[PDB]
Amino acid sequence: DSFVIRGDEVRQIAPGQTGKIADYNYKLPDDFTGCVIAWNSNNLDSKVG
């Protein structure tokens, strides 16, 4: 999967975590057997204005 979220919502992408970005947009199961990969991208996805 591939999506772009903010910094304070990266912790919500995890099995068991709940909130706003993890309950209405993208929900992970409690038995999720995988690896979450995220990194800062404040160089091409943020224009002036």
């Binding site: 099995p15 068991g16 975590q17 709940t18 409690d30």
Partner: protein, 49 residues
């Protein structure tokens, strides 16, 4: 003092049943002994423990 053994057996069975019933009112280290209250007060990820 004649019907002693039968009375003792009946009392032992009654005490065993009463203890088995009262064991449902213990926390065993949890926050409470009410499954509904636990599920209502905590989200499933935390209430699973």
């Amino acid at each position: 003092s004649a019907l002693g053994k039968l009375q003792d057996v009946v009392n032992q069975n009654a005490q065993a049943l009463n203890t088995l019933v009262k064991q449902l009112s213990s926390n065993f280290g949890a926050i409470s002994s009410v499954l509904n209250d636990i599920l209502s007060r905590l989200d499933p990820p935390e209430a699973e423990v």
